């Protein structure tokens, strides 16, 4: 059957090739890596997209250079599937080519590259991702924030504190989760302020970010907040002081 789909990858009709490629990514068998790399150059963009999608799903590092190359495809969906595929494979060789894709014309391609860079977890992405925090597109900024959170590098702490004031609630929200994930205590006071944010979800995430940071600094900020804070912020603190000792 994996035999059959590999065979259908060669069919005259692009649709047949398209669903051969998808099917093979689903089955997950290594035999299909080679013929799927071939399909990455199919003249049909849907085939190229399916092939790239499947290669990400198979997880095999032999597809890494072929996919780095698909980062240059004329089709933005193909380029998107290429970046996602390289994140999923996790091979460090993808890092500098995805760093470049952070400057792609298509913001969803930029976004996907930033996601993929968080998934790899490689330190080299930290600075370019810090720059992507100032991307024009709020989806990119959000995703850059979330990727820095997952990389966990201390250099992002101050830029993320700033993002906590971004005009878009969704960036502020991802900046708060990321600060929690990094665990650096510089985030405590800024996070305490974000408990005042207008957006309820920003508020809740800044609350759990503080729970994750923990330690004496959060404890003392909460003793103080349970005295001069109001609203959600005060409940967060009284709740914290209860559960934590």
């Amino acid at each position: 059957k994996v035999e059959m789909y590999i065979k259908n990858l060669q069919d005259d009709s692009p649709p047949v090739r398209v669903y051969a490629a998808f099917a093979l990514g689903k089955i997950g068998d290594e035999r299909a890596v080679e013929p799927l790399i071939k399909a990455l150059k199919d003249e049909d963009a849907s085939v190229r997209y399916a092939a790239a999608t499947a290669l990400g799903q198979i997880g095999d590092e032999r597809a890494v250079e072929p996919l780095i190359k698909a980062l240059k495809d004329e089709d933005g969906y193909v380029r998107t599937a290429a970046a996602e595929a390289l994140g999923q494979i996790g091979d460090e060789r993808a890092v500098e080519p995805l760093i470049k894709a952070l400057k792609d014309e298509d913001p969803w391609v930029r976004l996907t590259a930033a996601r993929a860079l968080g998934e790899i977890g490689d330190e080299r992405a930290v600075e370019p991702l810090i720059k992507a925090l100032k991307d024009e597109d709020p989806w990119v900024r959000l995703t850059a924030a979330r990727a820095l959170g997952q990389i966990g590098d201390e250099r992002a702490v101050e830029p993320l504190i700033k993002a906590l004031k971004d005009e878009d609630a969704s960036v502020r929200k991802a900046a708060a989760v990321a600060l929690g994930q990094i665990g650096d205590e510089r985030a405590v006071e800024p996070l305490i302020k974000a408990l005042k944010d207008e957006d309820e979800y920003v508020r809740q995430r800044a609350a759990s970010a503080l729970g994750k940071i923990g330690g004496e600094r959060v404890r003392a900020a909460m003793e103080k907040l349970a005295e001069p804070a109001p609203g959600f912020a005060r409940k967060v603190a009284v709740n914290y002081l209860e559960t934590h000792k």
């Binding site: 649709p15 669903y19 998808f22 913001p107």
Partner: protein
């Protein structure tokens, strides 16, 4: 007629009116479908402000007539066979450990345009659950949609589970139970048991400041031998 209407790229319109735990909303979609590729390209906007549920929870509600049936399976394509008068699609969707949606839609040609019109009601959702607390990731999995002939009436029964990624790394399940019945008289194909295998990518439009979802979808029928 049926499959004949689908031989090229057909334009699509989608209209949804929903009310979930009392929050009313609407969504309008526009785009196109190419059944030869089982391909959909669409953009959806919430026309009433912010969407009170996550966009991925609405993907299945928001045109299975654009699925690719392979040549040997054409006698199992109920969806296209009902056209142009179209069909009624009804679901109940159970979000595990949370509320449910019930939906009713009509899918039909209105002029040269395939149009999906839907009404959705959902209740018993948890205020800070995954749905209403917006904890779902902005992505979409690959699924198998199981289809069987409706023994009683001209129509089909359909069942599947949608897997929704949650941002903490767990998965939320949405059990779909579906029924489709034709609108018109024109007789319909009542198919052998089979399934559709789906693929979906969600994105955004960088020029769009409204709450919206861009969608690319690939679906093929499968599981009939040859």
């Amino acid at each position: 007629k049926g499959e004949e209407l689908f031989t090229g790229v057909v334009p699509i319109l989608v209209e949804l009116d929903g009310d979930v735990n009392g929050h009313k909303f609407s969504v309008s979609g526009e785009g196109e479908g190419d059944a030869t590729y089982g391909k959909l390209t669409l953009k959806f906007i919430c026309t009433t402000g912010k969407l009170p549920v996550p966009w991925p929870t609405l993907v299945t509600t928001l045109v299975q007539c654009f699925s690719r049936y392979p040549d040997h399976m054409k006698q199992h394509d109920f969806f296209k066979s009902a056209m142009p008068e179209g069909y009624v699609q009804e679901r109940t969707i159970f979000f595990k450990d949370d509320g449910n949606y019930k939906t009713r839609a009509e899918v039909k040609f209105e002029g040269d345009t395939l149009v999906n019109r839907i009404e959705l009601k959902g209740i018993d959702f948890k205020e800070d659950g995954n749905i209403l607390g917006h904890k779902l990731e902005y992505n979409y999995n690959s699924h198998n949609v199981y289809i069987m002939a409706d023994k009683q009436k001209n129509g089909i029964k359909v069942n599947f589970k949608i897997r929704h990624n949650i941002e903490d790394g767990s998965v939320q399940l949405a059990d779909h139970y579906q029924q489709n019945t034709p609108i018109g008289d024109g007789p319909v194909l009542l198919p052998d048991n089979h399934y559709l295998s789906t693929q979906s990518a969600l994105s955004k439009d960088p020029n769009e400041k409204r709450d919206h979802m861009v969608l690319l979808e690939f679906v093929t029928a499968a599981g009939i031998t040859l």
